Amino acid sequence: TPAIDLLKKQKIPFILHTYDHDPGDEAAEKLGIDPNRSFKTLLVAENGDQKKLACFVLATANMLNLKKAAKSIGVKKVEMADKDAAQKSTGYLVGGISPLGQKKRVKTVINSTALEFETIYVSGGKRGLSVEIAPQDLAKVLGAEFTDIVDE
């Protein structure tokens, strides 16, 4: 996948985990991961402008706080990206959106709590593939910031 191609091209350490998707957090369940280590990747539209997306990476059981997310990227408001807008921009389907190797690279923000883990797990770009990666190494590839972007 473009995500794994990218990590191999940049020589970034990672472990590839594979599970049979039976065709929310399937990866945490099938790989037996603590939930708070399993992260999902969401895209938002800056001021609701579906051509100006940004990427947010947060534990799958957390909820994205939109006001926090808009502050983290210095915009007045964000709305969730429409499905087609997220798919055309990233080249992935929901269920398989990786923060890595998106067709269009956009600014990325990882929730702060990622830093409490030696490694985290993010989508590898298709259902059934999970990339285990140190959070600071993820942030280094993507130029990402760590910021509180979640509720509770």
Walk me through this protein's architecture.
It is found in: Cytoplasm. GO terms for molecular function: Ala-tRNA(Pro) deacylase activity; lyase activity. Keywords: Cytoplasm, Lyase, Protein biosynthesis. With 152 residues, the chain is of the alpha/beta class. It has a single domain (1-152), classed as YbaK protein (Alpha-Beta Complex), CATH 3.90.960.10. Helices cover 25% and strands 28% of the residues. It is built from five helices and eight strands. It has helices at residues 2-10, 26-31, 66-72, 83-90, 135-142; strands spanning 15-18, 39-46, 49-59, 78-80, 108-111, 120-123, 129-133, 145-147. The strands form two sheets. Strands 4-2-3-5-8 form a five-stranded mixed sheet. Strand 2 and strand 3 (49-59) form a beta hairpin.
